[PDB]
Design a binder for this molecule. Structure first.
Ligand code: FAD
Ligand code: FAD
Ligand code: LUZ
Ligand code: LUZ
Lengths: 466, 466
């Protein structure tokens, strides 16, 4: 690489650039620091400038100039990923897509928009236009971009209904611009768009998204309280299996996390109580109450009876990695794991892991559709002591039937979600022959000897088969 | 010929009534004759009078008069049931709710309407009002009433998404009028409304329904063709488990049924071909094609590429018991079974039954959500020979792990769907102390020695818990 930052800058007159060191540093970091390991390994990473195109034409200008002057390019939505995805390991350009945030079309069942649209802004527009909203969104709803969700996220609120970004149909089309001497526009549909999902921006810049839309309902927050984690998980699993009770969220958070760390909801909680977090559609809420009364589920908070309370976060901001946010805000020693508990043994497996790590781990489940089954993903909190103990806890999950997607890594393959196969490798050669797009994030690109055919359970399995 | 018809008729001045023998006979029959057994057993059944109230006030005037003259009352929507549910075993009044067809409220996620609204009319109004439609409907969409669906049906198109009428949330509220000296109005919510579902009108007259609504999408008809039943069933099972691919129907119809009996679609079919009937939402259509190319599913008919669709019925009128209709319109010796193939063994079980009855049976699956899993319901065609052999075939399904809901019976308990327990018996006494509502349909009411704690698998399990 022969980086020439000065010549790059000269080629971008009319395009917004920022080179202030403090601002570049801030926009070179995400929420990697949720992992004590990443916090140490990536503490010294920073870019050289932030470039913020307003149009696809400006973006093409930027990529063309970066290819010519050999400046690395790391895409950034709003920098809320947890693994260092958007962090520029090699210096160079932080390519912000924040100003490519147009909403172009809203029709019955689908939307076309730019990558920088914030999830809640997209829903606000889809709701006003025709009472529609995203099928799923991360708990970073109000801050995260749709583009970064596709390229760096996996699922979240709404996965209970629709599965994950890993699944056919949850994305319709991705328009992607390559890093070639003449950047190419690709219109990826069918299976081809799934080369880009959760690829950390390593194989092209998403410049337009077509995604399905779902009906916007009056979603009712409710909490259900239990005296043990195992009875909370059994209730949550049963509720998730009620096919006529429409929910958007079914979470399990073990004591002592609710009472210790859900501070604004404390008056509804008590010491020793585990909680199930529920978002239930208004047309299903009476059925939800009747089911809960028949299933041992004491409703300790219900938005329909609590009144118009200000200062209460929505329950989804207590779920997914917002559960982690709340814990580490009070005690910074908390970190987390990412776990699958495979169907049909999720209740047995979550209980065994809960009992295996008393005190040191606090269980946290999110119920989701996964390959057509209802099961749960895990985001258990872990009290950090040493690097070695944290690796050991993950090793023991893997050895006890609970696949780990290691969040204490910053490469695609080590994170356990995006599998590298020959199709993934060939596509990056096509879309980034100089290796300028988010370098360092794909091990197989830097390692000719990499056994990318190893690993067991991949969340985003590769397209190659038979 | 009930002895009190003259006196009853004199009390109904101003209410529309019909005593013409031929019309009363037509309005005393449903589609029971799909069963050769019921066709013979119920041949002599007819009412004395058809009474058609326009309003709940008129209905109450009718019930109060029938109660004081002890004339039985058998409710009727539009008489499309298959079990003789709406046929008056004791003569008396056929009480048609067809003129109680108010639609009084449509909101995001729910609708309030009268019992006589035809399903497709309900959707016509919900679509015009706010682009909504029913979650599920029988394949008799264009002729069946909503109230008769609730009291006499179980699910259908849309069950792939939502389960069935057996499930919490798929009905929100039933307003019911009792048969008492002074008829009472009950507003049944929570679990209480499930006393009335599939109870054949034996424990009160539904006068208002609140049901959930779902978004009205552009549903695309597609057929997928296979050289064998097993490969068709395996594909449909896989498609049904694609959580991001939104469908409204996933049916499997084994050869020779499609080529023999799907006449207007015959130009798309070939001899020996089994078919999977699909309704896929427009926003999932591309993913459906991509999944099907990846899953060995040849799309042989697609409403978006087929050119002129004139004269083609919708694919849902080739599904559920319309599959039976198409077959028996060509050969009247076909009848059917109703089967469950319990998860997770549905592929092995359907294949085992298919191999056990060559020629005599034609397999027909409908994939549905059932207790939180994806599995299939069966409506296999059976070539009628003798009553004895039809019983044996059903016994063999039951003995091989495939529960039968016997459609060749006219009582609630023998039909295998609506379980009787103490709560059902107590409620019938509460709503119909004289037993004038559809008499003879509930064995346990006529026979206090009848053992209602038998029967293994009930589609509509009772409310009594252990
Ligand atoms: C408290 C908290 C809770 C969270 N909860 C969830 C959750 O429930 N579910 C979930 O999936 N994630 C969750 N996350 C992670 C993160 O917030 C989301 O995945 C988010 O949607 C990422 O979007 P972003 O705009 O912040 O992307 P960034 O962090 O800016 O970038 C993410 C990745 O996408 C790439 N990228 C961004 N834009 C483009 C583009 N246009 N083209 C190509 N590549 C691009 C970046 O290079 C990077 O590799 C959470 C994070 C926090 C801190
Ligand atoms: C070709 C064909 C296909 C079919 N497909 C399906 C299918 O996919 N799914 C399905 O579930 N059914 C199916 N059916 C059965 C039937 O069409 C439906 O269940 C239908 O919705 C019944 O409504 P109806 O108005 O015809 O009721 P009716 O036949 O008039 O009556 C049904 C029952 O409900 C009672 N009843 C009616 N109205 C009231 C009321 N207001 N209050 C109390 N009791 C009342 C009657 O006494 C009777 O017991 C099919 C039938 C045919 C002929
Ligand atoms: O950066 C993240 N990417 C993800 O896919 C994710 N998924 C769940 C929770 N946090 C997450 N964080
Ligand atoms: O009269 C019917 N009642 C039902 O519940 C039903 N379910 C499926 C198919 N036909 C059916 N016919």
């Amino acid at each position: 690489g022969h980086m020439n930052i000065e010549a790059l800058t000269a080629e971008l007159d009319g395009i917004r650039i920022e080179d202030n060191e403090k601002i570049v540093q801030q926009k070179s970091r995400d929420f990697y620091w949720y992992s004590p390991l990443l916090k140490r390994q990536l503490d010294h990473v920073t870019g050289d400038l932030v470039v913020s195109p307003k149009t696809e034409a400006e973006l093409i200008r930027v990529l063309k100039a970066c290819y010519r002057h050999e400046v690395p390019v790391t895409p950034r939505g709003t920098g809320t990923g947890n693994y260092g995805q958007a962090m520029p390991l090699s210096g160079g350009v932080v390519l912000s897509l924040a100003d490519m945030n147009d909403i172009r079309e809203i029709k019955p069942g689908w939307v076309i928009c730019g990558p920088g649209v914030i999830c809640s802004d997209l829903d606000k527009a889809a709701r006003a236009h025709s009472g529609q909203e995203l099928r799923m969104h991360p708990s970073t709803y109000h801050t995260a971009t749709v583009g970064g969700f596709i390229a760096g996220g996996s699922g979240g609120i709404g996965s209970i209904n629709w599965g994950g970004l890993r699944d056919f149909g949850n994305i319709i089309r991705l328009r992607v611009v390559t890093m070639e001497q003449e950047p190419q526009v690709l219109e990826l549909t069918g299976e081809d768009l799934h080369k880009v999902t959760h690829a950390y921006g390593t194989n092209g810049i998403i410049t337009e998204i077509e995604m399905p839309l779902a009906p916007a309902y009056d979603w009712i927050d409710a909490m259900v309280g239990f005296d043990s984690f195992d009875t909370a998980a059994a209730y949550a699993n049963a509720l998730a299996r009620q096919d006529g009770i429409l929910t958007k969220l079914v979470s399990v958070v073990a004591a002592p996390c609710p009472f210790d760390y859900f501070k604004r909801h404390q008056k509804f909680l008590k010491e020793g109580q585990s909680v199930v977090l529920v978002m239930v559609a208004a047309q299903s809420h009476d059925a939800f109450k009747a089911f809960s009364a028949r299933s041992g589920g004491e409703i300790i908070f219900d938005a329909t009876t609590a009144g118009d309370l200000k200062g209460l976060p929505p329950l989804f901001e207590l779920s997914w990695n917002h559960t982690t946010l709340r814990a580490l805000r009070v005690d910074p020693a908390w970190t987390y794991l990412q776990v699958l508990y495979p169907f049909p043994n999720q209740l047995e497996l979550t209980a065994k892991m809960d009992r295996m790590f008393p005190g040191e781990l606090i269980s946290h489940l999110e119920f989701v559709r996964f390959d057509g089954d209802i099961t749960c993903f895990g985001l258990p909190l872990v009290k950090f002591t040493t690097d070695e103990r944290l690796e050991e806890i993950m090793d023991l999950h893997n050895a006890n039937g609970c696949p780990i997607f290691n969040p204490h890594r910053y490469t695609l393959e080590e994170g356990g979600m995006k599998q590298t196969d020959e199709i993934q490798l060939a596509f990056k050669r096509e879309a980034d022959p100089k290796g300028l797009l988010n370098p360092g994030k794909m091990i197989a690109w830097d390692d000719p000897d990499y056994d990318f055919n190893s690993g067991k359970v991949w969340l985003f399995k590769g397209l190659k088969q038979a």
